Amino acid sequence: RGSFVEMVDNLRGKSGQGYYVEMTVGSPPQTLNILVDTGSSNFAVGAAPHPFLHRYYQRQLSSTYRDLRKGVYVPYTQGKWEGELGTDLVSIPHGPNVTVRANIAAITESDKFFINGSNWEGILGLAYAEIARPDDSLEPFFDSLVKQTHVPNLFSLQLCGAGASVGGSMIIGGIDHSLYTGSLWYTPIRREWYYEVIIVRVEINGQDLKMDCKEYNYDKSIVDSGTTNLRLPKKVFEAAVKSIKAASSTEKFPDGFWLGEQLVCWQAGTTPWNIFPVISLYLMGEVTNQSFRITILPQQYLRPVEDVATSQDCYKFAISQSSTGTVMGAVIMEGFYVVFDRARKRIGFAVSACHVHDEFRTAAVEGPFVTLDMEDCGYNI
């Protein structure tokens, strides 16, 4: 407990292409890069020679593979992934020294699932059984790991981010104190499906948005390492933007930029960070009527876009509207060291030692604060 040097820096990626960890599957071990995803619950890997993929899982080569004789079909708005369920021996080379028999969805067809140019071939769904596909009988990887080893029921993420290569750490079964400054503050996991949390108050540059409790969590708030943006519910997004525009009145920008429909650029080394507000989410504390506050910088919500071939320091506004509730994606998580305390049904937040900041302002985790009716920020059908 406390120092996990072997796991420090085990996360890699490219800006906007997520964070991945090296894993091995089967015997002999087939190495794959796997996207760390706290927003889903399936261990799903490419199993066929899709042209975008560096490699893929080849079941024929593995003496420990076991077929479950069940397909799985996961559709969504932009496309789909489908696969054949099995189990096999799984390890994380830069994780604990254990091998687990876990479920593997072997991907055999997809549409707009894999990213062209990316270096990952699969997705580690780290959320709970209730949202595993096809159903909650399919035990998620982390449940198998805890059930089969002496690994504590906890993991933490330091997602580092650029300011294009990213990095960070996934501490399996513990916390590394060198990855954060100040103290951890815990928010309760409302229900064990996604990592669900309750946002209790929103401030832009210290100004309360003044909306009802309930809107911030309509229909859900989640902590999601598989989403880039801070995604806010429609009404919350509107009020936030009105406020951000107002705070950034010194320089004007087209209306499309705020909808992430176009980019905006400055001359190199001359970004006016200072003209942009801090954003504060207050989270339900551990104790009745107690809350804490996390604060992100423009360095977190203005993402550097290197990819633009039509221009030779451009940025994307990475706060966006949602119909699925609040999603605290990379925009949030790049500010903090995030502890998913599954054992104690809570998520810790602390200032990330690696978060990108300037000489003037820092990402912050502050408390305690007094907030009443925090249960009422929560949503029910």
Ligand X SMILES: C[C@]1(c2cc(NC(=O)c3cnc(OCF)cn3)ccc2F)N=C(N)SCC12CCS(=O)(=O)CC2
Q: Kindly state the smallest distance separating residue 97's Cβ from ligand X, in Å.
A: 28
Question: Residues 212, 224, 313, 373: which is the catalytic one?
Answer: 224
Give the contacts of 217 (CB within 8 A, at least 6 positions apart): 198, 199, 325, 326, 377, 378, 379
Nearest in space to 176 (alpha carbons), one of 11, 356, 367, 363:
11
Residues 90-119 within binding reach of ligand X (CB under 6 A) = 113, 115
The 3-state secondary structure of 260-271, one letter per residue: CCCCEECCCCCC
Looking up tokens 């705020």, which residue turns up? 258
Using rule CB under 6 A, residue 76 touches ligand X: yes
State the nearest-atom distance from the C-beta of 141 to ligand X, in Å: 14
Does residue 378 interact with ligand X by CB under 6 A? no
The binder of ligand X chosen from 227, 280, 291, 371 (CB under 6 A): 227
Residue 373 among the catalytic residues: no
Q: How far is the CB of 56 from ligand X (least distance, A)?
A: 16
Enclosing H/E stretch for 245? helix 234-247
- Within 13 A of 295's CA, how many CA atoms are on the CB side? 16
Q: How far is the CB of 108 from ligand X (least distance, A)?
A: 15
Neighbours of 12 (CB within 10 A): 18
Residue 67 annotated to the active site: no
CA distance 377 to 129: 25
Q: Of the listed pieces 32-40, 62-70, 173-181, 287-295, which binds ligand X according to CB under 6 A?
A: 32-40
Residue 236 CA to residue 23 CA, distance in Å, equals 38
Nearest CA to 198 out of 272, 292, 296 is that of 292
Amino acid at 292: F
DSSP state of 368: E
Segment interacting with ligand X, rule: CB under 6 A, options 204-212, 225-233, 234-242, 263-271: 225-233
Q: Is 196 in the site for ligand X (CB under 6 A)?
A: no
Residue labelled with tokens 């602390």: 350
121 counts as binding ligand X under rule CB under 6 A: no
16 binds ligand X (CB under 6 A): yes
Candidate list 39, 122, 174, 304; residue touching ligand X; CB under 6 A: 39
Residues 6+ apart with CB under 8 A from 141: 43, 90, 100, 102, 103, 124, 125, 126
Which among 37, 88, 143, 176 is annotated as catalytic? 37
Nearer to ligand X by Cβ, of 190 and 303: the residue is 303
Q: Is 349 in the site for ligand X (CB under 6 A)?
A: no
Question: In this structure, how many other beta carbons lie within 10 angstroms of the beta carbon of residue 1?
Answer: 10
Per-residue tokens: 34: 């796997």
CB closer to ligand X, 222 vs 374 = 222
- Site stretch for ligand X (CB under 6 A), options 212-220, 226-234, 264-272, 277-285: 226-234
Does a cis peptide bond (omega within 30 degrees of 0) precede residue 28? yes
Taking the complex as a whole, the smallest distance from the CB of residue 182 to ligand X amounts, in Å, to 24
Binding track over 263-302 against ligand X, x by CB under 6 A: ----------------------------------------
Q: Which stretch binds ligand X (CB under 6 A): 83-91, 96-104, 219-227, 356-364?
A: 219-227
Binding of ligand X at residue 40 (CB under 6 A)? yes
User: Which one, 119 or 290, has the nearer CB to ligand X?
Assistant: 119
Query: Binding residues for ligand X, how many (CB under 6 A)?
Result: 16
The nearest distance, CB 167 to ligand X, in angstroms, is 11
Cα(232)–Cα(238) distance, rounded to whole angstroms? 9
Which residue has the closest beta carbon to ligand X?
Answer: 39
228 is a site residue for ligand X (CB under 6 A): yes
Beta bridge partners of 207: 204
Is residue 218 within 8 Å of residue 376, measured between CB atoms?
Answer: no
Helix, strand or coil, per DSSP, at residue 86: strand
Which residues are known to be catalytic? 37, 224
Q: For binding to ligand X (CB under 6 A), which residues are involved?
A: 13, 16-18, 37, 39-40, 76, 113, 115, 123, 224, 226-228, 330
